[PDB]
Symmetry: C3
Subunit: 213 residues, 3 copies
Amino acid sequence: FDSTDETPASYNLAVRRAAPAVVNVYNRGLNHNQLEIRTLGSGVIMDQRGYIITNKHVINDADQIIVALQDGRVFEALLVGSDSLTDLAVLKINATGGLPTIPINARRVPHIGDVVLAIGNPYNLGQTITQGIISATGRIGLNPTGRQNFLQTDASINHGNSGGALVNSLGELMGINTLSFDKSNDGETPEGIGFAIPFQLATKIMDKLIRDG
Amino acid sequence: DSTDETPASYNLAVRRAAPAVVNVYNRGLNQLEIRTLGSGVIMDQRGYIITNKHVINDADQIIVALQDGRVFEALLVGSDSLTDLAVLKINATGGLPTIPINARRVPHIGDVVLAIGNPYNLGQTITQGIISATGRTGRQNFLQTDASINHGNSGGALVNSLGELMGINTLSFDKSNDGETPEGIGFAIPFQLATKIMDKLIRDG
Amino acid sequence: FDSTDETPASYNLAVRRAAPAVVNVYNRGLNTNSHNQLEIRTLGSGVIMDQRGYIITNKHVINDADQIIVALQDGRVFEALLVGSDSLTDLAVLKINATGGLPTIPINARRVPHIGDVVLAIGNPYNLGQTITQGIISATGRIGLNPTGRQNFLQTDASINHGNSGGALVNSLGELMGINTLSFDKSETPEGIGFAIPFQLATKIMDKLIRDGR
């Protein structure tokens, strides 16, 4: 066979569309005049004004919040506001050049079985893309998350992924990665159970935090 | 503008297969509480359900919960320790969703598969992997998969992108080497074998 | 008309093309406690690179071997000779002598691996037998300094376990992307973080070791 003309199966289109808007978020603290990285996570640039969604846990008790873009630009971020109920926080960067923004299709309904990519900075390795599916789109009854509206996914999520993007194969934002199941019942480590705040809610909470705080 | 583009998805398989995958509760006298939980697959309109033997062992009461909200008390038809399969029976009156079965489908290594079950009682969960290997003390024959399988997935379904049953999820490899956790190594009883075991158990033979 | 031809989504084509060329590699040492018998000390994977019987594996799989055994998926078993190893890249080259035709790994020298490409990892984790796992290319290298200490690793979330080392990472076409080498294993258990030597570097090192042995 000659595969030179065949095309490898790929979600690179989604990567090129979405990944430039996903940032590395650095929670710096003083411990001396010199600042040190205390926590790191990810964030998503939502619009051209410089508003960024991240996770509240990532940015709590920060003396300085740093945002690093995949294009090499580094900004100091301002905390616009945070919501403990949803674990979301909004940041603001002041930029000249123009900013990459996350694709959002407000009319897209996420479906269970949809291929998704998680985009973030696990263990400070640098931007990482992982692939899974939507395992669930919320819950009707009471469940161990205590919430009714999480997207669940088996796209590998690690420490440093929090605040980052979950996108479909088109690069459209599905959710903001927030949690990974860790409760081992009998020695066994949970595998491929992760949670994201649905994009519709993330949009709404951002808008309210921008205007109110 | 991706408005008319179509997201890559295995939702078709989900719609076809997931309604037939049930939550299995091993309940024990407390009053009455949940002891072990797993999953099960509704195999036919008669109300016969395949599950895992370790899920239902020593139960005072076996409860089966469907995704449509119906809850039934299940009766233990029989179990097979050699294959770790058990058959349950619920009230078939009122119509039941059943698992798609293609008896002529040959499972191939590299086939995309979805695992369907109730891990950690989170509610029905779909995970995606591929068939990693086939034909895997013990003389058992398994399909191996990297579709994430967790405590509570046992007795549940492994299906292909068409929603056709490939196997019954049974085991997750956890044998560490130099102090490390295995990732993406899971085992399912092939559907042909499971069907055979179910038939024998129903006959009581 | 009653039997239609719908087929499930599958990477079986890549499997059929690539998997025959991925071998199980056994590092065997003789012990002086049981009748000078050879026993397995380490196991990994390897990739048959050309018809002559040259095989890429990881250096750490074949370190201190009294005997290196190579097992093919068709059932053939060979004693391999160590051609050479490179500690800088953790690659080793083996040589087998076969009468029949050997299966070889598909290589497209003009293929550029892209982040998001579907990949399959092929190897022998925990001596279960050849195992195929599926992920994507998570990253194709790093510009900045990072915890791996290196700049050219392909990162992947295709599940990699003990025994996968020296084995193949291929795309959906069966074309070699890299040689699986490392897993991020200890700090929280990391999930879906694995590393492969890019096929271009693996090919350059192999040719060097075949020519010189160094």
